[PDB]
Write an enzyme that holds these catalytic residues in place. Structure first.
Site, PDB file in Angstrom:
ATOM      1  N   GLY A 169       0.804  -1.205   0.000  1.00 47.77           N
ATOM      2  CA  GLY A 169       0.000   0.000   0.000  1.00 47.77           C
ATOM      3  C   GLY A 169       0.843   1.263   0.000  1.00 47.77           C
ATOM      4  N   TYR A 191      -9.659  -0.271  -2.419  1.00 47.83           N
ATOM      5  CA  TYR A 191     -10.619  -0.119  -1.320  1.00 47.83           C
ATOM      6  C   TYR A 191     -12.060  -0.228  -1.816  1.00 47.83           C
ATOM      7  CZ  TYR A 191      -6.772   1.830   1.571  1.00 47.83           C
ATOM      8  OH  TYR A 191      -5.607   1.999   2.269  1.00 47.83           O
ATOM      9  N   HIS A 233      -5.430  10.964  10.025  1.00 42.85           N
ATOM     10  CA  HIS A 233      -4.028  10.552   9.884  1.00 42.85           C
ATOM     11  C   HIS A 233      -3.207  11.329   8.842  1.00 42.85           C
ATOM     12  CE1 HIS A 233      -5.953   8.567   6.546  1.00 42.85           C
ATOM     13  NE2 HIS A 233      -4.777   8.216   6.057  1.00 42.85           N
ATOM     14  N   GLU A 249       0.134  10.241   6.168  1.00 43.53           N
ATOM     15  CA  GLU A 249       0.624   9.001   5.592  1.00 43.53           C
ATOM     16  C   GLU A 249       1.786   8.484   6.414  1.00 43.53           C
ATOM     17  OE1 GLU A 249      -1.200   7.539   3.105  1.00 43.53           O
ATOM     18  OE2 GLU A 249      -2.380   9.344   3.538  1.00 43.53           O
ATOM     19  N   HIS A 297      -5.867  13.953   7.250  1.00 42.04           N
ATOM     20  CA  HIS A 297      -7.177  13.824   6.619  1.00 42.04           C
ATOM     21  C   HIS A 297      -7.987  12.680   7.222  1.00 42.04           C
ATOM     22  CE1 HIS A 297      -4.074  11.645   4.371  1.00 42.04           C
ATOM     23  NE2 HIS A 297      -4.988  10.713   4.153  1.00 42.04           N
ATOM     24  N   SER A 352      -5.190   3.370  -4.283  1.00 42.98           N
ATOM     25  CA  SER A 352      -4.202   4.308  -3.771  1.00 42.98           C
ATOM     26  C   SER A 352      -2.819   3.716  -3.496  1.00 42.98           C
ATOM     27  CB  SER A 352      -4.725   4.960  -2.495  1.00 42.98           C
ATOM     28  OG  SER A 352      -4.961   3.989  -1.506  1.00 42.98           O
TER      29      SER A 352
END
Ligand SMILES: N#Cc1ccc(O)c(-c2cc(C(=O)O)ccn2)c1
Ligand SMILES: [Mn+2]
Ligand SMILES: [Zn+2]
Length: 351
Positions: free
Chosen positions: A167, A174, A185, A187, A273, A285
């Site tokens: 990921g 997703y 969070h 990244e 976000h 993603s």
């Protein structure tokens, strides 16, 4: 000047031409040159001419190895999400559950109506998220914005060490249903992320500007002191949900945007976000980096309470892109301070 562009740190939306859309890192540097990064989050609508896959009609057979049932506990706009792993199932099976009466989208006029229902029923009737599915829906030949091969400098991680991080430098899919959530969070290693909505109902996002991230952290530490004491970066557990009314009430700047099928979202280093899906949908993603990311990466505060948290060695990046500072950095005496308003060096041709 950095400060003079997007001074309100609002989420921006970009409509590149096909020529612009062709060089990924160029356009990232360009939107940064317009102050997009200050928001933490940006929307990019690709040219109507463009499509990453001809047909999605074949995927009902695709396996979701570890669907997650999302249990949420809390009140007064503060919540903690617990994951319960369900037995594997197919997109067909998932879609049937998602569109089923028990789990499907309530009806509504304006977005604020659906939004109010999300924060009202968050804790009831827990949904299932087909999350962290290893793979891609890009046809093998699509060369623009291919999440499977963006060719940014994040590639230095695999190149040097052979290490893949699922990921992060590999693609995730997703599969959503109504009221499925992603917690507040940044990244891993405070990288960038790219998120593409292949199909289905919208996905809505909240974002806090990087220049105000520390503020959100202070607030979170105050509201979850137990978690804060156990971990130096407990938001990285991705379990913590905070309603936009709670952010307003405590003066944390933030912005909202809703993502439609066929739209891109870019998150920027140290951009906090969170959000939720409107119904059955599918998103893809991965993370990526620019030269600007390196300093964020060097300074990212990581989860201390788990052995399987994601930690990328910064060494190869400092050697290759900050050779003056390598010795100093390795001697723990590199006191560089980050200016969240500054755009990435690669935008020297657009500055
Ligand atoms: N758990 C977790 C996790 C770890 C890293 C991420 O970037 C996201 C995430 C997930 C979504 C999404 O579920 O659509 C959107 C934005 N961020 C979620
Ligand atoms: Mn994210
Ligand atoms: Zn931790």
């Amino acid at each position: 000047e950095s400060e003079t562009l997007n001074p309100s740190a609002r989420i921006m939306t970009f409509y590149p031409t096909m020529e612009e859309f062709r060089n990924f890192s160029r356009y990232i540097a360009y939107i940064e040159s317009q102050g997009a990064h200050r928001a933490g989050l940006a929307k990019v609508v690709p040219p109507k001419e463009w499509k990453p896959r001809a047909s999605y009609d074949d995927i009902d057979d695709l396996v979701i190895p570890a669907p997650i049932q999302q249990l949420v506990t809390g009140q007064s706009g503060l919540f903690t999400q617990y994951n319960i792993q369900k037995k594997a199932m197919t997109v067909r099976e998932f879609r049937k559950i998602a569109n089923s009466d028990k789990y499907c989208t309530p009806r509504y006029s304006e977005f604020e109506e659906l939004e109010r229902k999300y924060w009202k029923n968050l804790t009831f009737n827990p949904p299932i998220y087909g999350a962290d599915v290893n793979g891609t829906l890009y046809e093998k030949h699509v060369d623009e914005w291919n999440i499977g091969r963006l060719r940014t400098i994040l590639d230095l991680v695999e190149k040097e060490s052979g290490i893949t991080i699922e990921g992060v430098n590999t693609p995730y899919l997703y599969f959503g249903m109504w009221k499925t959530s992603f917690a507040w969070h940044t990244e891993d290693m405070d990288l960038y992320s790219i998120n593409y909505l292949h199909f289905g109902e919208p996905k809505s996002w909240y974002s806090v500007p990087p220049e105000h991230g520390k503020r959100l952290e202070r607030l979170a530490k105050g509201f979850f002191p137990g978690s804060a004491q156990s971990c130096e970066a407990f938001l990285r557990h991705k379990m913590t949900l905070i309603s936009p009314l709670m952010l307003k009430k405590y003066g944390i700047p933030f912005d909202k945007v809703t993502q439609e099928a066929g739209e891109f979202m870019i998150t920027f280093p140290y951009g906090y976000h969170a959000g939720f899906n409107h119904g059955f949908n599918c998103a893809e993603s991965t993370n990526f980096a620019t030269r600007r990311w390196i300093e964020y990466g060097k300074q990212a505060v990581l989860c201390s309470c788990r052995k399987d948290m994601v930690k990328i060695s910064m060494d190869v990046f400092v050697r290759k892109f900050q050779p003056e500072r390598y010795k100093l950095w390795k001697a723990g005496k590199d006191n560089t301070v980050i200016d969240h308003t500054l755009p990435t060096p690669e935008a020297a041709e657009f500055l």
